[PDB]
Amino acid sequence: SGSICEARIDFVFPEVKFPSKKVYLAAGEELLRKLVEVHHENLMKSKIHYLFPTSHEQLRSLVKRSADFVVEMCGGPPYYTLTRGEPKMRARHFSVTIDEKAREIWLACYKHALKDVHFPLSVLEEFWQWIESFSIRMINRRTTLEPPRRVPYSEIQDFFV
Amino acid sequence: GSICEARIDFVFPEVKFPSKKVYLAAGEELLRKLVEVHHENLMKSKIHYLFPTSHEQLRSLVKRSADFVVEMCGGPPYYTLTRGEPKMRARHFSVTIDEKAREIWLACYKHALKDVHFPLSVLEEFWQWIESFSIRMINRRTTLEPPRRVPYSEIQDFFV
Ligand code: HEM
Ligand code: HEM
């Protein structure tokens, strides 16, 4: 008698490949920490700078934890899970409004950081594909029916050369 | 390296739109009264801040919202003739709506339904419609848990 709308999904959170330990091995802990540092400097120069701390202590605390996480996830020593514990990154991000644009700007900041620290080309794709896909899971505010944009490494490789 | 497999957050469940029985049972006047007191409830609720405050702007909201409800229950096409295609999730992107907001919005409708003495025969039909359709308006997630289902059977005693 009355119309029926089928069950639906908004969008799929794609599978994410975490980087192998080769990334830690080829890049080294110090480059990885420097990567995260200039990623944050780009963020404070981006349209989403307001989501981030201004007090140099809070910021240093953030960078350190992000760097610990990145180093560990790239195959390094368990700096993060031994200090902060379980990752549960989607849940930890609920307290910050993250829409599709926010993810795209965050990615852009990482892209530039990767080039500016001269991240070794041979492990660049493995790192990129991780953050590109993983970042989709942090999105907690939707503003469009369209799915979050996929940005494959092939689309951006020329930028690194 | 480790791979986390693809996943969904939650499913937008099936939604059953009301049959014309709801409009024939209630009549347009009651449906407009229902929407009016749903909005009086909203203005006293903890999501009041999401809504305009002047009589002029609320009258407008209420009129549009009621036009939609009347048409969707099987009455005249007041909404499509004026506002056009529903696209309701899309229209709500402009309001920040988390899980609690949907629950509060539903609670306001639950009380309105009772206070306007909505005809008991079509009460569940109307309820199951908004209970499910409202999940599709949520655009701000604050928990990994799925949005609460509130089936008519869990609240049917509230009405009598
Ligand atoms: C998608 C867009 C993203 C935005 C806009 C964003 C922004 C933020 C903000 C504002 C914080 C502040 C800390 C807090 O919430 O208390 C934070 C924390 C953090 N973010 Fe993100 N983030 C994004 C994605 C990611 C991704 C993909 C990762 C994966 C490596 C990540 C890793 C972290 C870590 C490790 C912390 C610190 C957690 C802790 O203190 O234990 N973020 N992020
Ligand atoms: C789930 C929680 C919901 C919240 C918090 C919410 C809140 C709002 C707000 C703030 C507005 C705009 C107010 C204004 O323009 O002055 C609006 C408009 C409207 N809402 Fe909702 N809403 C919700 C769910 C729903 C549902 C389930 C329906 C289904 C009938 C609905 C139907 C409408 C209609 C028809 C409009 C008018 C759109 C237009 O201007 O054409 N809403 N809502």
How does this model look, in words?
- Two copies of one chain form a homodimer.
- Chain A has one domain: Globins (Globin-like, Orthogonal Bundle).
- Chain A has seven helices and two strands.
- Chain A is globular and about 65 Å long.
- In chain A, helix 1 (21-27) packs across helix 6 (121-134).
- Chain A is mainly alpha-helical and 161 residues long.
- The A-B interface holds A 1-10, 12-21, 75, 90-91, 94, 97, 126, 140-145 and B 1-9, 11-21, 74, 89-90, 93, 96, 125, 139-144.
- One protoporphyrin IX containing FE (HEM) is lined by residues 48, 51-52, 62, 65-66, 69, 84, 89, 92-93, 95-96, 98, 102-103, 106, 131, 134-135, 138 of chain A.
Summed up:
Chain A is mostly helical and 161 residues long.
Main beta sheet strand tally, sense and closure of chain A = none
Supply the number of helical segments of chain A.
7
In this entry the ligands are:
protoporphyrin IX containing FE
In whole angstroms, how far apart are the ends of chain A?
Answer: 61 Å
Name the CATH class of chain A. Answer: Mainly Alpha
What is the H/E order of chain A? EEHHHHHHH
Category from helices, strands and their pairing of chain A: mainly alpha
Query: Mind telling me which CATH architecture of chain A this is?
Result: Orthogonal Bundle
Per the principal axes of the C-alpha atoms, what is the gross shape of chain A?
A: globular
Radius of gyration of chain A: 17 Å
CATH topology of chain A: Globin-like
How many domain modules of chain A?
Answer: 1
What percentage of residues of chain A falls in helices of 4 or more residues?
40-55%
Largest interface: A-B, 32 and 32 residues
Q: What's the CATH H-level superfamily name of chain A?
A: Globins
Oligomeric composition of the shown chains: homodimer
Q: Provide the β-strand percentage band of chain A.
A: under 5%
Q: What is the number of strand segments of chain A?
A: 2
Organism (chain B): Methylacidiphilum infernorum (isolate V4)
Keywords (chain B): Heme, Iron, Metal-binding, Transport
Protein name (chain B): Hemoglobin-like protein
GO molecular function (chain B): heme binding; metal ion binding; oxygen binding; oxygen carrier activity
